[PDB]
């Protein structure tokens, strides 16, 4: 078997956004360079609304 669990099922995904979301769901099953945790932000702005 190429993979213990497939990265995603191609028939299920419909657009590029679906591919990205599926990769984020199954990313724990792979050997990851950086194990995800809570993220850190250094810049943030809020524009005026209507």
């Amino acid at each position: 078997k190429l993979f213990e669990t497939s990265p995603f099922d191609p028939l299920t995904i419909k657009n590029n956004q679906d591919v990205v979301d599926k990769l984020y769901a199954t990313q724990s099953s792979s050997i990851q360079e950086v194990v995800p945790t809570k993220t850190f932000a250094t810049e943030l702005q809020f524009g005026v609304t209507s």
């Binding site: 724990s28 194990v35 945790t37 809570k38």
Partner: protein, 61 residues
């Protein structure tokens, strides 16, 4: 020690966040310890169930 190691092995086998012992108190036969999830994910009933199961498939039900 053996219980924590076994839970870590099970958490590796089936993908689940791991545990890490912060502090403990152990008087007589009564013990209380605080365990921290390594990745910071919130505690889940699956995690508690797996930790409670102790020596699974090694001892009797």
């Amino acid at each position: 020690t053996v219980a924590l190691d076994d839970y870590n092995n099970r958490a590796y086998r089936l993908n689940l966040p791991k545990l890490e012992l912060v502090t403990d108190n152990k008087v007589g036969d009564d013990s209380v310890e605080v365990l921290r999830v390594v990745d910071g994910s919130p505690l889940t009933p699956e995690i508690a169930k797996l930790y409670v199961n102790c020596m699974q498939d090694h001892a009797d039900k």
